[PDB]
Design a protein around this ligand. Structure first.
Ligand SMILES: CCCCCCCCCCCCCCCCCC(=O)OC[C@H](COP(=O)([O-])OCC(O)COP(=O)([O-])OC[C@@H](COC(=O)CCCCCCCCCCCCCCCCC)OC(=O)CCCCCCCCCCCCCCCCC)OC(=O)CCCCCCCCCCCCCCCCC
Ligand SMILES: CCCCCCCCCCCCCC(=O)SCCNC(=O)CCNC(=O)[C@@H](O)C(C)(C)COP(=O)(O)O
Ligand code: SF4
Ligand code: SF4
Ligand code: SF4
Ligand code: SF4
Ligand code: FES
Ligand SMILES: [K+]
Ligand SMILES: [Zn+2]
Lengths: 95, 113, 263, 208, 48, 126, 176, 360, 114, 96
């Protein structure tokens, strides 16, 4: 979800944009500002919450040794989903 | 049999190695007699020089003398005898059997610091 | 003087009666590994990382708690001391989570450092680990309780120094959880110091969360000005920006604590 | 301890200990320590007044014959009052051996040049002048060898900073490469890496 | 491909005359190869 | 004779190539570094350290990095004792200030004191 | 266990002396050298037709840096700063914060490609395979600061080259 | 025409390498050694790795030792091709440069397949090597080595019996053996003068005591004997590579002490101890025990040594780099007296001088 | 408090050597201006040599002034021989460096440093 | 490899060698660019038992250097090692 400042400048996924009175916009004059349009905070929120039937799940990000270190997530809160601190995939105990 | 070259560049062949070795060993013992008796350089160098001179007096051959002196060619054994002679002539001047000139400072050789 | 003579690795050292084995090793300049012992907390003895061999004694003793007797030869580097350290470290790392990149304690972790120093270099644990529900004890102390090693420095600090008596252990066995058992918020005036004494990233600083990392920080020793105590602090910076404020030890002022405002 | 641990050599350890006793009692006027490391390397710590009598000994004596000067080195140690530690690495081809002859100096006391023993030293200690500021007496042509021609200071001292004090750039006003005080667009990030737990109990120092 | 040519000549690209709006009839470029063919052309794999 | 008598104070500032601005305006600090309270290890509190006063760090206009103009900004020297550090500072013409070593005082530890009869040092839990 | 290069005495019979003088006067070894050069004239050369043909590379190749994402679009980097701790040239500059969902992510990830020594210690220090040094070597610029990459350029190199980086890591992760 | 004096001024590539090493860890200091003798990359890697492993009191696995000797002899081929062909290129023979840099291109493909970089691999590490051989690499090393003898034969066709090549090398750069030893020469600079000294024979490292090779000995100490010594060292390197390809053992490629060598990436993502050890090795690095070693190898230019001093920390306190070319270029002044200006460039060619190792 | 000398037994031999080094530099300055085709005057270069000598005029140790004579002779040998270029000679004249603030008020204006 | 037999014979004659036997250009004899996945073996410390690290710790068995002489009979003069053995001339190819 990229947006645009009043100066016409794209705001990055970090939130950086130069101010109106900031001289450092002159580096983009006649050139471009390279932002990445694939925001990971948007793409991870599109994922479905995975319903599992255990009390503690494991997550390695998929792909085995191609993902992240394997972590175990406790799913005892029925208020909040159990979110992987590495990959951001989130889990819910189905009962 | 007159070995054609020593194999080392700038090291000529000695035609009469035994007489040259006897002259150099007796000259090392002559210079080394000027050192005091308590000096370990005198005792150690007299020991090795008398052993080498005994071996040179014991062997007529050049090849077997090279195999039992155990110093490579006979010409670099002659070179080593000359270096030992020059060293002992310097050791007369330096007098290193004397006690230590200065103790090092208190943590001069302490590693790790 | 009633000083008795004890031996650490054969070296003689004169100690006051009632000296623990850890303090006798500390007098000859040797630091025993520990997780629950803290020199300003009460002695718990519940991590077993300090187990050292007394010679002519067929049992390792908890050096954090055991008083010395006269003439003990403490063997800090013997074989069964090292086997005790490696075994206890393996049990500490069995259910411990692989969070070292996403953990703020990384680079300043006692569990990492004395896993490198006193433990084995690989795992034999072929099972699944535990995962513990995170607690909410305030907007200051981030709580990730899977990383907890149940050393009870929380509870001894909050009981003895902060005078709170609200942290505790619930349950029994491998399900023993350190928490408050209820949705209760641990806000003392000294509630930040549990981030200092926790040897793992189970309790971390929520304002300092994810922002820096201890090897790239410049440690400027300075003074607090928030009160008139004059608490000695470390301002740690990174690339010309203040990252956090830690305590310095001064025995006469702030012993090794600071208030939450200072922190 | 078989597969991953380096196998200890006891024979060369014993031989280097015996030869260190030999060198120490032949030359007790200068020899201050003799030590053999666990990986079997012999170090002869001598007094700086005996650089030449020791090194001419080991080059010329018929039980030493250290005919090659492999490397000559200085090490700055600022916690010593003689902060520089001059290190001679010697190779005896005849006995297939290596020896280390270590001595010391501070900023001001000269060391005698060993070019009359090993001509190989002619640049090394010259490098030691350029990098550490250890003056060598009776060196044939002592000058700088590695730094720039107008360079002030001696870089491999540990009180000298990593980047220098001056940087260079072409200035177009003066049509010339010029020196200015160094200003980095990004400072070198000093990392505090040392763990606070002791790694090696064998090397523990006695406390105060 | 030409597997009878020697290793280095055996795979090649003819670049297009127009890519992303730019006339590349003469101004062909080594970075005009997309990444799925970049393994094949640089012989990082046997499979196109 | 071959030894002379020099009774002047040891000062090598004209030899080290340091410019004058980073001799007389810098304040060397000589101190045993305080223990990181994140850890219980004390191996980093063993040797004395000499650092300098931190000068300006500012933002790179292009990238946002920490730019500096201080050559001595990363210079940390390590000394076995305090007096070696003081002698190295006085030898180089550095104005220094020394903080004394803060040693932790020996505490009185007793496990049975957690379970006393009449004292306040009973622990309420374990 | 040793041999003597150049320890041959030439033979002194009239056959060998006349052979050496015919070599001297009639230039036999020079015609040998001309013949070896003429033998290379009629060989197929080793020249590849760059840029239409490319030099062969391996999947271990260390080229242009890129930041990878998961197969959900979430970026792999969790701001642990191991790559900038291991970086031998201090080419990596990382700043982080918790972002709006509490995830541990970077706000700054700079690689100076003019400090970088292209040794790949960052990709092998990375615990999540986030920073990788990809297959691209054709990224010469006309300006110095176009090689001063920030997080946007690195995530765009990941999005640009992921179809190839995933296959190189597929072919080489079992050696790692 | 005569050269009375030759004063080399160096420092034009002085980069303060070994002051930069004091502020980096041991793993971070390893790629500096690729860039010293930058036609002998893995040999300098091997010298520094042997130095660190000697201070660490650990040893590499046998397969890593055979890979080190294999790639060190591939490196010796690289360095002597560079040496011989640029020494001929300065004198004027420009063509075997082009003939032998294609074989050198194939050996850079071997480096790129084993490490991912054609020159500065950072591959030989303290504790073993970084990564195992990719499957099919040793077959291609076999197909290179089987044909490389004909390439040496046609180089030696183009130079050895050539009268113009002999007239530029035979009376030139004569060093007596005693002056070669007294000037700190090493390698071919000794063995051209008849000295029977090679560190792979006399003070052998990793598995050189298990390979069978000859040592070419010069007889006159000139540029021509040193040329023939380098050609025959390429021959004997092909012999060693044949033996290493025949005798490569199975097993691991790092030391299985995981407090020195990093664990595998599959087990770093599974085990707690492996992730802790991966973390601490790639941030702090391993602590090396305190002490000082002087570890030397027979690099293809001569004795390449490291005097490495650890103070106990995970960073080197001191790392002096003894390079052969430093003492060789020091002896350039004696080697060129009584010769001419076109002979000094041949002397500079036959002392294989790369100024990265001269200047550090 | 008894140390080994470098060249001088006392301060007087050291001042003899300092004096002879100043003589040699004073003689060499016109040759230096001519062959490096410097655009300074000879008087300006002799003033710079006077400044570089009088910077060190506070040193009361014979060993330190012996080393200063040694380093000055090395600079002189690098100037007599064309080993320095024009740039290394002109680095004594800090031309591209803007004059720094010297008083308190302007250093207060420009930044934080004393 | 694609050269005609006339050019092949000319090239072999001008070099004086059989050049087609050892071609410096590479063809289908080299390894496949795509390989099957490996199963690399583990080291000797990948054992679930009898694998305490205190019994295979290389860095902790490093000792401080043993001080032989320090400033706090008719015994044999020693060398640092026995004298080096004279090398044998090569039986393979001595050039003699
Ligand atoms: C001598 C005069 C030239 C005679 C032709 C010639 O020698 O052809 C090379 C021909 C093949 O040489 P090769 O080195 O074995 O090359 C093998 C390739 O596979 C053969 O090459 P290829 O298989 O790759 O075939 C493609 C090649 C086919 O090659 C040709 O057509 C050769 C060019 C013929 C003119 O065609 C091209 O590449 C197009 C080239 C077009 C321009 C050629 C130059 C013209 C110069 C005159 C104007 O040589 C011979 O057959 C032997 C010598 C013949 C002497 C004839 C009497 C004198
Ligand atoms: C073109 C420019 C090139 C610049 C030339 C750079 C060479 C500079 C060499 C520096 C050598 C020195 O400064 S050694 C001087 C140190 N002397 C002392 O500390 C003792 C005091 N000496 C003096 O005051 C000298 O003026 C005298 C003449 C020896 C004594 O005068 P006082 O009596 O009244
Ligand atoms: S607490 Fe320590 S061992 Fe556990 S994840 Fe954090 S850094 Fe790693
Ligand atoms: S949260 Fe930390 S201090 Fe509290 S009991 Fe657990 S490990 Fe100990
Ligand atoms: S390849 Fe090496 S130098 Fe480049 S960013 Fe990665 S770790 Fe740093
Ligand atoms: S790229 Fe990898 S190593 Fe670097 S900070 Fe991100 S997760 Fe850590
Ligand atoms: S320290 Fe004694 S058991 Fe925790
Ligand atoms: K904590
Ligand atoms: Zn996950």
């Amino acid at each position: 979800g990229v947006r645009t400042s009043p100066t016409g400048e794209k705001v990055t996924h970090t939130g950086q944009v130069y101010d109106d009175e900031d001289y450092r916009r002159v580096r983009f004059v006649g050139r471009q500002k390279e932002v990445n349009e694939n925001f990971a905070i948007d793409l991870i929120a599109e994922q479905p919450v995975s319903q599992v039937g255990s009390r503690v799940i494991s997550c390695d990000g998929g792909g085995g040794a191609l993902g992240h270190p394997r972590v175990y997530i406790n799913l005892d809160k029925e208020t909040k989903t159990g979110t992987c601190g590495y990959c951001g995939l989130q889990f819910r105990q189905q009962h | 049999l007159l070995k054609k070259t020593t194999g080392l560049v700038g090291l000529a062949v000695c035609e009469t190695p035994h007489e040259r070795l006897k002259i150099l060993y007796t000259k090392i013992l002559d210079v080394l007699g000027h050192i005091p008796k308590n000096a370990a350089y005198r005792k150690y160098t007299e020991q090795i020089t008398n052993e080498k001179l005994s071996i040179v007096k014991a062997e007529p051959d050049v090849k077997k003398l090279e195999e039992q002196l155990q110093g490579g060619q006979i010409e670099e054994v002659i070179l080593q005898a000359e270096n030992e002679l020059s060293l002992a002539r310097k050791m007369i001047q330096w007098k290193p059997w004397e006690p230590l000139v200065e103790e090092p400072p208190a943590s001069q050789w302490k590693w790790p610091i | 003087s009633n000083l008795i003579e004890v031996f650490v690795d054969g070296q003689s050292v004169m100690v006051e009666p009632g000296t623990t084995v850890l303090q006798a090793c500390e007098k000859v300049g040797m630091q025993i590994p520990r997780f629950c012992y803290h020199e300003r907390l009460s002695v718990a003895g519940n991590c077993r990382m300090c187990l050292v061999e007394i010679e002519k004694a067929p049992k390792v003793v908890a050096a954090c708690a055991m008083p010395v007797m006269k003439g003990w030869n403490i063997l800090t580097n013997s074989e069964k001391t090292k086997k005790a350290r490696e075994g206890v470290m393996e049990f500490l790392l069995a259910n411990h989570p692989l969070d070292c990149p996403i953990c703020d304690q990384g680079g300043e972790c006692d569990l990492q450092d004395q896993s490198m120093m006193f433990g084995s270099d690989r795992s034999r644990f072929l099972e699944g680990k535990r995962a513990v529900e995170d607690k909410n004890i305030g907007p200051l102390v981030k709580t990730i309780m899977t990383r907890c090693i149940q050393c009870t420095r929380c509870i001894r600090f909050a009981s003895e120094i902060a005078g709170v008596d609200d942290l505790g252990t619930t349950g029994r066995g491998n399900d023993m959880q350190v928490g408050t058992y209820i949705e209760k918020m641990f806000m003392s005036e000294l509630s930040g110091n549990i981030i200092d004494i926790c040897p793992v990233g189970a309790l971390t600083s929520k304002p300092y969360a994810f922002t820096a990392r201890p090897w790239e920080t410049r440690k400027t020793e300075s003074i607090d000005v928030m009160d008139a105590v004059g608490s000695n602090i470390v301002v740690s910076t990174r690339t010309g920006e203040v990252m956090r404020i830690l305590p310095r030890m001064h025995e006469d002022i702030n012993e090794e604590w600071i208030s939450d405002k200072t922190r | 301890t078989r597969p991953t641990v380096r196998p200890r050599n006891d024979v060369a350890h014993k031989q280097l200990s015996a030869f260190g006793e030999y060198v120490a009692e032949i030359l007790p006027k200068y020899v201050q320590q003799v030590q053999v490391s666990c990986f079997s390397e012999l170090e002869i710590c001598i007094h700086p007044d005996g650089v030449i009598p020791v090194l001419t000994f080991l080059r010329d004596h018929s039980n030493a014959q250290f005919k090659s000067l492999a490397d000559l080195t200085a090490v700055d140690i600022p916690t010593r009052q003689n902060r520089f530690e001059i290190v001679y690495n010697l190779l005896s081809l005849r006995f297939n051996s290596r020896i280390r002859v270590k001595t010391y100096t501070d900023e001001l006391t000269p060391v005698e040049s060993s070019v009359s023993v090993y001509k190989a030293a002619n640049w090394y200690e010259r490098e030691i002048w350029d990098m550490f500021g250890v003056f060598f007496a009776n060196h044939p042509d002592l000058r700088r060898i590695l730094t720039d021609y107008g360079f002030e200071g001696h870089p491999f001292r540990k009180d000298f900073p990593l980047s220098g004090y001056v940087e260079l750039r072409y200035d177009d006003e003066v049509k010339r490469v010029v020196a200015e005080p160094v200003e980095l667009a990004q400072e070198f990030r000093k990392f505090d890496l040392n763990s606070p737990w002791e790694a090696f109990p064998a090397y523990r120092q006695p406390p105060e | 491909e030409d597997n009878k040519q020697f290793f280095g000549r055996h795979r090649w690209v003819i670049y297009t005359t127009e890519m992303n709006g730019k006339n590349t009839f003469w101004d062909v470029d080594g970075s005009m190869v997309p990444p799925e063919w970049h393994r094949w052309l640089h012989c990082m794999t046997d499979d196109p | 004779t071959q030894l002379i008598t020099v009774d002047e104070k040891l000062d090598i500032t004209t030899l080290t190539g340091v410019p004058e601005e980073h001799i007389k305006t810098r304040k060397a600090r000589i101190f045993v570094p305080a223990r990181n309270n994140m850890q219980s290890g004390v191996n980093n509190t063993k040797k004395w350290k000499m650092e300098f006063d931190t000068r300006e760090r500012w933002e790179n206009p292009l990238m946002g990095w920490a730019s500096t103009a201080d050559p001595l900004s990363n210079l940390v020297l390590t000394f076995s004792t305090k007096e070696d550090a003081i002698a190295f500072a006085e030898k180089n013409g550095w104005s220094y200030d020394v903080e004394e070593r803060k040693v932790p005082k020996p505490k009185s530890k007793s496990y049975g004191a957690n379970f006393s009869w009449n004292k306040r040092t009973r622990v309420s839990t374990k | 266990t040793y041999k003597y290069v150049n320890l041959r005495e030439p033979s002194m019979d009239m056959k060998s002396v006349t052979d050496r003088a015919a070599q001297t006067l009639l230039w036999t070894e020079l015609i040998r050298g001309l013949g070896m050069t003429l033998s290379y004239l009629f060989r197929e050369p080793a020249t590849i037709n760059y840029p239409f043909e490319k030099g062969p590379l391996s999947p271990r190749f260390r080229g242009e840096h890129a930041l990878r994402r998961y197969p959900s679009g979430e970026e792999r980097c969790i701001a642990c700063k191991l790559c900038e701790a291991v970086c031998p040239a201090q080419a990596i500059t990382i700043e982080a914060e918790p972002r709006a969902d509490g995830s541990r992510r970077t706000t700054r990830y700079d690689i100076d490609m003019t400090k970088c020594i292209y040794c790949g210690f960052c990709q092998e220090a990375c615990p999540v395979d986030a920073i990788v040094e990809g297959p691209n070597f054709e990224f010469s610029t006309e300006t110095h600061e176009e090689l001063l990459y920030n997080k946007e350029k690195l995530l765009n190199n990941g999005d640009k080259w992921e179809a190839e980086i995933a296959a190189n890591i597929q072919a080489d992760y079992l050696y790692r | 025409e005569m050269v009375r004096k030759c004063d080399p001024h160096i420092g034009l590539l002085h980069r303060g390498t070994e002051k930069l090493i004091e502020y980096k860890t041991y793993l971070q200091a390893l790629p500096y050694f690729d860039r010293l003798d930058y036609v002998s990359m893995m040999c300098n890697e091997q010298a520094y790795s042997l130095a660190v492993e000697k201070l660490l009191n650990i040893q590499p696995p046998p397969r890593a030792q055979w890979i080190r000797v294999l790639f060190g002899e591939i490196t010796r081929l690289l360095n002597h091709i560079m040496a011989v062909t640029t020494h001929a290129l300065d004198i004027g023979a420009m063509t075997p440069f082009f003939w032998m840099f294609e074989e050198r291109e194939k050996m850079f493909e071997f480096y790129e397949r084993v490490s991912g970089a054609r020159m500065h691999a950072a591959y030989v590490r303290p504790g073993g090597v970084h990564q195992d051989l990719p499957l099919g690499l040793m077959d291609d090393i076999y197909e290179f080595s089987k044909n490389f003898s004909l390439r040496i034969d046609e180089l030696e066709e183009m130079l050895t019996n050539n009268r113009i090549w002999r007239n530029r090398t035979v009376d030139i750069g004569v060093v007596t053996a005693e002056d070669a030893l007294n000037y700190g020469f090493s390698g071919v600079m000794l063995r051209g003068s008849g000295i029977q000294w090679d560190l792979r024979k006399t003070q052998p490292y990793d598995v050189y005591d298990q390979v069978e090779f000859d040592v070419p000995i010069g007889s006159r100490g000139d540029c021509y004997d040193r040329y023939l010594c380098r050609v025959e060292e390429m021959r004997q390197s092909i012999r060693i590579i044949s033996q290493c390809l025949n005798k490569m053992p199975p097993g691991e490629i790092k030391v299985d002490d995981a407090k020195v060598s990093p664990p595998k990436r599959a087990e770093m993502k599974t085990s707690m101890e492996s992730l802790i050890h991966h973390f601490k090795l790639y941030t702090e690095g391993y602590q090396v025990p305190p002490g000082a070693t002087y570890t030397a190898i027979e690099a293809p230019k001569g004795e390449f040594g490291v005097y490495l001093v650890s103070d106990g920390s995970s960073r080197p306190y001191r790392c002096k780099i003894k390079a052969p070319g430093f003492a060789h270029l020091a002896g350039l002044d004696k080697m060129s007296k009584g010769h001419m200006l076109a002979d000094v460039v041949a002397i500079i060619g036959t002392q294989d001088i790369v100024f990265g190792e001269v200047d550090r | 408090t008894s140390v080994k000398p470098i060249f001088s037994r006392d301060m007087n031999e050291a001042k003899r050597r300092v004096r002879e080094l100043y003589r040699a530099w004073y003689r060499e300055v016109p040759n230096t201006v001519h062959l490096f085709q410097l655009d300074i005057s000879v008087k300006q270069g002799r003033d710079k040599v006077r400044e570089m000598f009088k910077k060190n005029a506070h040193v009361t140790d014979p060993r330190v002034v012996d080393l200063l004579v040694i380093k000055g002779k090395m600079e002189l040998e690098e100037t007599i021989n064309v080993w320095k270029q024009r740039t290394h000679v002109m680095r004594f004249f800090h031309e591209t460096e803007a004059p720094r603030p010297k008083d308190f008020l302007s250093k207060f204006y420009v930044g934080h440093d004393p | 490899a694609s050269a005609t037999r006339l050019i092949q014979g000319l090239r072999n004659w001008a070099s004086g060698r059989d050049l087609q036997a050892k071609l410096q250009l590479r063809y289908q004899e080299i390894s496949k660019r795509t390989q099957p996945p490996p199963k690399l073996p583990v080291g000797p410390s990948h054992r679930l038992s009898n694998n305490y690290y205190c019994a295979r710790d290389g860095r902790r068995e490093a000792m401080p250097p043993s001080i032989v002489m320090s400033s706090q009979s008719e015994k044999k003069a020693v060398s640092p090692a026995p004298p080096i053995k004279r090398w044998e001339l090569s039986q393979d190819e001595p050039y003699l």
